[PDB]
Design an enzyme around this catalytic site. Structure first.
Site, PDB file in Angstrom:
ATOM      1  CD  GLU A   1      -3.021  -1.011   0.100  1.00 19.15           C
ATOM      2  OE1 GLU A   1      -3.036   0.023  -0.580  1.00 19.15           O
ATOM      3  OE2 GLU A   1      -3.815  -1.947  -0.103  1.00 19.15           O
TER       4      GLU A   1
ATOM      5  CG  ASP B   1      -7.837   3.487  -4.378  1.00 18.95           C
ATOM      6  OD1 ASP B   1      -8.406   3.917  -5.400  1.00 18.95           O
ATOM      7  OD2 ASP B   1      -8.391   2.652  -3.628  1.00 18.95           O
TER       8      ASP B   1
ATOM      9  CG  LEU C   1     -11.733   3.458   0.486  1.00 15.38           C
ATOM     10  CD1 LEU C   1     -11.266   4.140  -0.786  1.00 15.38           C
ATOM     11  CD2 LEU C   1     -12.555   2.215   0.152  1.00 15.38           C
TER      12      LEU C   1
ATOM     13  CG  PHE D   1      -5.865  -3.635   4.148  1.00 16.57           C
ATOM     14  CD1 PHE D   1      -5.507  -2.714   3.171  1.00 16.57           C
ATOM     15  CD2 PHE D   1      -5.679  -3.301   5.481  1.00 16.57           C
ATOM     16  CE1 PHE D   1      -4.999  -1.470   3.532  1.00 16.57           C
ATOM     17  CE2 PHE D   1      -5.179  -2.058   5.836  1.00 16.57           C
ATOM     18  CZ  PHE D   1      -4.833  -1.157   4.861  1.00 16.57           C
TER      19      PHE D   1
ATOM     20  CB  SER E   1     -10.524 -18.589  -4.713  1.00 18.63           C
ATOM     21  OG  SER E   1     -10.871 -18.053  -5.976  1.00 18.63           O
TER      22      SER E   1
ATOM     23  CG  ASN F   1     -10.537 -20.364  -8.918  1.00 18.75           C
ATOM     24  OD1 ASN F   1     -11.009 -19.683  -8.009  1.00 18.75           O
ATOM     25  ND2 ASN F   1     -11.271 -20.842  -9.919  1.00 18.75           N
TER      26      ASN F   1
END
Ligand SMILES: *SC1=NC(C)(C)N(O)C1(C)C
Ligand SMILES: *SC1=NC(C)(C)N(O)C1(C)C
Ligand SMILES: [Cl-]
Ligand SMILES: [Cl-]
Ligand SMILES: [K+]
Length: 162
Positions: free
Chosen positions: A11, A20, A32, A104, A117, A132
């Site tokens: 990040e 972002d 965010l 996150f 998945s 996948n």
């Protein structure tokens, strides 16, 4: 390496409001603020999060404060989610970090949507899960970060971050 160091790499750290990879107002270590196109809306979210009238700029200590809250929130989101918790419980610590990383970035609801998945991860079919996971908007939009997270699921090591 650990979840904090991992997400700090993925990040970055920026002390002023920025957009972002999705174009959304963000600050700190991938915090965010809002999906609203209104900078004023983003600034209001920032003031509420920090607890003071900011100028759209925070300190490093404040960025780290929000980051710790956000890592906690991601883990909480996993543990409270009927789809995510069993998978998390089943994973080793390194792969747990990979799952926290996904939550996150995309949120609890989004990751819980990766039904097939998640099943492959719980089955410990790591190469299959990796194939996948890449078949996703997530991978397509952030392929380098997704490759690191996927490598972490595939190998159970921190090799992608070292
Ligand atoms: S968390 C938090 N943010 C700042 C940097 C203002 N702090 O002193 C706390 C309480 C650790
Ligand atoms: S679980 C959880 N903890 C906080 C309060 C941070 N949340 O908003 C969630 C994601 C519901
Ligand atoms: Cl097992
Ligand atoms: Cl597949
Ligand atoms: K970022």
């Amino acid at each position: 390496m650990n979840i904090f160091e991992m997400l700090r790499i993925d990040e970055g750290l920026r002390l002023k409001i920025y957009k972002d990879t999705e174009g959304y107002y963000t600050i700190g270590i991938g915090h965010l603020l809002t999906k609203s196109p209104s900078l004023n809306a983003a600034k209001s979210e920032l003031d509420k999060a920090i607890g003071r009238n900011t100028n759209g700029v925070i300190t490093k200590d404040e960025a780290e404060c929000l980051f710790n809250q956000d890592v906690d929130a991601a883990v909480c989101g996993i543990l409270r989610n009927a789809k995510l918790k069993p998978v998390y419980d089943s994973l080793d610590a390194v792969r747990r970090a990979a799952l926290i990383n996904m939550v996150f970035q995309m949120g609890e609801t989004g990751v819980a949507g990766f039904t097939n998945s998640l099943r492959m991860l719980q089955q410990k079919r790591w190469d299959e899960a990796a194939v996948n996971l890449a078949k996703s908007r997530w991978y397509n939009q952030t392929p380098n970060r997704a490759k690191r997270v996927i490598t972490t699921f595939r190998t159970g090591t921190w090799d992608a971050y070292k």
